[PDB]
Design a protein around this nucleic acid. Structure first.
Lengths: 314, 308, 311, 315
DNA sequence: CTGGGCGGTAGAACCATAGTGACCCAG
DNA sequence: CTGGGCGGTAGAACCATAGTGACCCAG
């Protein structure tokens, strides 16, 4: 039988996922949310695209975690992101930690009940924290659960570099590890263009250290830059998630940077962090540890510590 | 060079248009709107997806109609939609928007293929035809590709068959007075009647499906959503049959020049879309009752047109 | 894991099937043939395209039916087609290909009795049934290549006369693959509209259509005479059937299938629209033919029976 | 019109798979050309039917006249002699093909100058680094509009074998092979990457050894011969790689691809073609990327160019 | 006028979109 | 029983494919 993909959280990212799943004919889809009616309106609208996509994927809405039964893949986008109400007086980012943890407790008990064999991809912020919470509460194997990070962060670094150098955006390859968010580690040494080290282009003066540094800042701050323009980053995220999902379902064994459990790589254990892994039929088939230098380790360490500062507060 | 596609209106539907055009690598995309900054924001979000999709489309934002310069396709979703009061009251206002767009199309891309979406589409498209001055095989409205996609989908579900394998025609006007042609429905090329006679589906089941298709927009709004995914996709099907010269047969709103007995009005019929825009207008051989429904659809477009 | 697809026979049809399978990321592919080494060479050349296609399918060559182990789909193109010369009797190949089906079905029992089987070896409507008998698979799991291929020509020709998308023309040809095919002039449509309307509008004449039908019946023969032999369209038609099964698309497709009373016939295979999805043949759709068209159908079936008697 | 019109000059096995892929991918109208009578018409007629399966709308035509180059957007040249033409040709070696295939290129290039001076041309006829320059010389087209097939094909064998060893996606291996297509290709150990990471990190991790890499390198060099030794013939991958190049052009993808291109100073060489990564978009070769080779790598490039030169002198 | 207590994957209304700011009272 | 002319994007025939080897005299 066809893959069943559950979307836990039917907000904007969730809507773009549904769309791309039906474009790619990837599986049946359930748009789940606690908010009533709304996932149904989106599922119906999106289901008609089967005709235009020449696909055959059921799309439905849901308001019950019972719909997790038989799920092949679960994608968690739902969670608090801002002050929940007008009443929440002087609240900050950290305040959201106990609330999302409560959501992950609930979702994980239902995974454990309804789809202990699903492959799980967590997006809810801060993802490196949230993914570990959901791994702990679901009981799923460490290679069947991952967090969204590097694909997205890097797709913006690839893209900004590709514009300066006038090549296919995907012919830029870059790594960004450790954590998603402000403390992300941008690995200047591990950038390439058509498989050629970025440094050769800096030597030909096709791009300079300072323009690269400025691209490094714009990458770290992309989500802010977009919100400042009166929009919201949701298309990019959705597509990077679907890339990861697709690599699992179709067993492409792509090298993709995800948040994953470190069992001693980079000198860290029992914490999840961003690192390229190989994604196939078996989940995370390979965790690849980049042979960082000392100043690269130092940055990696500060991203891990920050993951740890927030985990403790959940 | 690569095709330039300009989205005139960057609300949700426009957002799904960019997205799809970058997945099929179909053209550079400009997201235009009068709302300051937001199109820049969405353009910037969408553009990153070149990477996941292996594409190489430039995706821009814009607040000037100057960026119509060199457009090969323009897609027009902008316009007043919300407020009892009378929906007819929006007609002169959206007429004023068509004027504006039209004269800018006159200046910057008189050779563009134009697709109109703004409701009521059959009126909006003619008004923009008229102010843009473009030739008549180069402008169309969205109508039946979207409408027939529900009908197609709903039937395929009852019959357990690939959605796309159901073909069905909906003519006349987009909206309330749309004409659902039961005699023109087929499943794998086979008339539906054969499946009714086999009792794989009943006449009253089909009737329920018909009412469901006419009220789909309303249903979705009732559900606390609003249709934009399917409309986007159906429009990108149109723009892609044109850009790739596929000559697909697609129902759309086009100028009637005597067909169905009507003139000087736009209305939903099958056409063939390809590199030359509207390449043929297929006029279905309607019996007398189907023709009474067509006529009511047209008279409704006319009645709205007179108020524009 | 990914779908395993065994191609039993690695002539040129086999080759195009492995390419498209890799282009569509459909499944690992095994090219089997009785001829030594040749399938390993083709496997090797095909496996490279994974890189250009962004796919990840294994392509292996084999000379052993043991490689049928774990197959999800099996496509049988192997068999004698050529004379031992000049004027001779093509019926002579019937018994010989019968032995081959016997042998394949022997190993299909052993190795992959749950596989979906697609048979191509001509005359297909006889060979498919022969393989159904010697393999023992459910009748919803074994179909022959027929109408997807034949109609694709019909649809293609009409599309060129009318200047629309090839795919926007639909038509049915049923009964048998080959010279007795029944071309149903009443079931052709163009973007969902009866052909008759375009006929009434003088955009294609009745005579033009008849000449198009003659050409659809004689397409193989026209290709051979231009010194080619048709294998691209066949491969792609088989890949359409395959895909609909593997991706559970539920496409309506004309295939050689087991008849249980439809068109008045039983215990024979013949061409008819089916629905293909993850359960195999999911519906056998019986066209509501008038007795003139039905008479054509019995002609096609009679021929199939006659050839079946000689195998 | 656009559609693109793509003319396959040579309707043999590679031309056959190319036409098919062009239809699968809706890339444009296809003319299968060849001097052999009728066969291109038959092949083009079999291939035309697949438009229905593919949901495409490409014309597929046969032709026996160079007149059908009129209005081509892309020309792909696979025609040429690859073996001793006849039983009567005794004691032929590879060099003897050079004058024959040169005559072919004079004939093709004359017709391009006449009917499609603005086409983009991809040459595949072996030895390809000599043949592309001969067609450049005899056609008169700009140097950014003519390339030969080399590195995309060779690199796909090395990306492949590595990926099998490391159990990753074949295309998440990137590698560079330069200089020339054939025996003297230069395999750059230093440039290999697996999902963006130097192959040296996996070697350090003992996931692949230096000796296994070397043996993979030998296989890459001899793949054509290893296929033919198994009673088959490499035509699928070649046709795939060619379509990859063509596509990057017809869609202005600006992919970095290794092609045989005109060297003007890069690697210390001029007035010769050789394999190097290039950028291919709407304007043809939009950039020629010179890899920053070290002196032993460059001595290798120098043996590749030398060989190309030796054969060029013989055409 | 505050201060805090709900209750919240918030809450209005702006108005060619959607991020910003979005409660309620007792006392 | 060799030799070499002509003509060749070669040429037979082996056959469950296709690469290998594939002409034809005049002396």
């Amino acid at each position: 039988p066809k893959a069943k993909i559950v979307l836990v959280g039917s907000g904007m990212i969730g809507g773009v996922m549904a769309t791309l799943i039906v474009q790619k004919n990837l599986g049946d889809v359930v748009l789940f949310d606690i908010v009533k009616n709304m996932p149904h309106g989106k599922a119906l609208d999106t289901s008609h695209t089967n005709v235009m996509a020449y696909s055959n994927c059921k799309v439905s809405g849901s308001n019950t975690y019972d719909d997790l039964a038989g799920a092949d893949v679960v994608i968690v986008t739902a969670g608090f992101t801002k002050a929940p109400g007008k009443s929440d007086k002087e609240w900050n980012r950290d305040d959201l930690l106990p609330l999302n943890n409560k959501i992950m407790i609930e979702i994980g008990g239902h995974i454990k009940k309804n789809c202990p064999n699903a492959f799980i991809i967590v997006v809810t912020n801060p993802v490196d924290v949230m993914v570990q919470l959901l791994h702990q509460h679901s009981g799923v194997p460490k290679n069947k659960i991952i967090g969204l990070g590097g694909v997205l962060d890097t797709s913006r670094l690839k893209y900004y570099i590709s514009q300066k150098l006038n090549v296919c955006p995907r012919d830029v390859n870059a790594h960004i590890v450790g954590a998603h968010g402000n403390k992300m580690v941008l690995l200047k040494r591990y950038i390439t263009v058509g498989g050629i080290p970025l440094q050769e282009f800096i030597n030909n003066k096709l791009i300079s250290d300072a323009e690269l540094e400025a691209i490094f800042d714009r990458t770290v701050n992309t989500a802010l830059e977009i919100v400042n323009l009166h929009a919201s980053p949701y298309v990019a995220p959705a597509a990077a998630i679907i890339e990861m999902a697709e690599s699992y379902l179709k067993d492409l064994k792509k090298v993709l940077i995800c948040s994953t459990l470190l069992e001693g790589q980079y000198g860290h254990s029992d914490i999840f962090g961003g690192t390229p892994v190989v994604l196939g039929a078996n989940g995370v088939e390979q965790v690849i540890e980049l042979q960082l230098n000392s100043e690269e380790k130092a940055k990696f360490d500060e991203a891990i510590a920050e993951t740890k500062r927030m985990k403790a507060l959940a």
